[PDB]
């Protein structure tokens, strides 16, 4: 989506519902994870892809569910399968978890507004 929380406005930390209509194309974002159970997170959103256009997602979001399927404790492959096979309309519940995400990316941290910074 377009930028909404500007400057040092805090990024909302409650869960949100995002509905992406992508037909039979990719969603246009990457997911990262480790074990099962530590969370599936958005690491990257492709410029001009369906998530960028049709959705309101950001790097650092945890994917809580896809089309009502709970992914909070999913394995990485099964989360990828769930997303790829979700169909043309994809309803994601996401929640911004930048502290957890920041542990994946080198020299990264969370600033006072909740933004992920990489030095």
């Amino acid at each position: 989506g377009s930028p909404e929380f500007l400057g040092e406005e805090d990024i909302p930390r409650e869960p949100r519902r995002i509905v992406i209509h992508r037909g039979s194309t990719g969603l246009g974002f990457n997911i990262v994870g480790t074990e099962d159970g530590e969370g599936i997170f958005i690491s990257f959103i492709l410029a001009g892809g369906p998530a960028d256009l049709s959705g309101e997602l950001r790097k650092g979001d945890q994917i809580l569910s896809v089309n009502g399927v709970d992914l909070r404790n999913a394995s990485h492959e099964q989360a990828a399968i769930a997303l790829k096979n979700a169909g043309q309309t994809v309803t994601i519940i996401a929640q911004y978890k930048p502290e957890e995400y920041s542990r994946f990316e080198a020299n990264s941290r969370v600033d006072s507004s909740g933004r992920i910074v990489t030095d």
């Binding site: 974002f29 990457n30 997911i31 990262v32 994870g33 074990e35 492959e77 994946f104």
Partner: peptide, 8 residues
């Protein structure tokens, strides 16, 4: 470590 990344 045991880290994985995938495009969807």
């Amino acid at each position: 470590k045991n880290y994985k990344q995938t495009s969807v």
